[PDB]
Design a protein around this ligand. Structure first.
Ligand SMILES: O=C(O)CCC(=O)C(=O)O
Ligand SMILES: [Co+2]
Length: 203
């Protein structure tokens, strides 16, 4: 299935089949670059653990964000993006109408019950030409999606295991975020939610 909105679609239950292989390749990456909490420059500490794969990796600190080839926690390169991450990503991107997308970054998020991503706009990328591909894995989450300005009426959507969201073009600098993840069980993730966001950061 494929719905909305405006240079952005939801590919519903798109990563369903590959979820077992994604989870496995998430784990493989994690055994190299582990998950960790990150302190926002505003002093707040994020309830979302995260790590990276691909050419570039995004981390926030006290001075601010950074895209890096080096993992600041290991002082070695971020794991190469797994075959299945790459394949899945462009297969989503094509179906979303971005045939010439190729990411170099992949920020992997892990949410516990009560974890939240504050409303933000994917901003720290120089090349606004490329779209964002978000993969939802595990427990269901409510993903809010507004627009350019902060005050745009947000719309609340249930993102479920396998669900995929691609946004770019006119909808690229759009405010979006995550509400406190409700507790539950999922076969594959047990009691959490994984989320991959694919991005072009270099080029
Ligand atoms: O968990 C999500 O679906 C949101 C991910 C996101 O927007 C980000 O990593 O910047
Ligand atoms: Co984002």
């Amino acid at each position: 299935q494929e719905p909305l909105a405006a240079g952005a679609v939801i590919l519903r239950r798109f990563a369903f089949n590959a979820a077992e292989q994604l989870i496995r390749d998430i784990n493989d990456v994690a055994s190299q670059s582990p998950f960790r909490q990150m302190v926002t420059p505003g002093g707040y500490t994020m309830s979302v653990a995260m790590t990276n794969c691909g050419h570039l990796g995004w981390t926030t600190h006290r001075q601010g964000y950074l895209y890096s080839p080096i993992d600041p926690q290991t002082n070695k390169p971020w794991p190469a993006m797994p075959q299945s991450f790459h394949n899945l990503c462009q297969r989503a991107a094509t179906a979303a109408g971005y045939p010439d997308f190729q990411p170099d970054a992949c920020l992997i998020n892990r949410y516990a019950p009560g974890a939240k991503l504050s409303l933000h706009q994917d901003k720290d990328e120089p090349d606004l030409r490329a779209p964002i591909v978000s993969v939802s894995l595990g427990l269901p989450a409510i993903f809010q999606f507004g627009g350019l300005k902060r005050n745009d009426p947000l719309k609340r959507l249930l993102l479920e295991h396998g669900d995929v969201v691609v946004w770019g073009g006119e909808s690229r600098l759009f405010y979006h975020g995550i509400q406190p993840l409700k507790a539950g069980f999922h076969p594959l993730t047990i009691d959490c939610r994984y989320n991959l966001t694919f991005r072009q950061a270099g080029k």
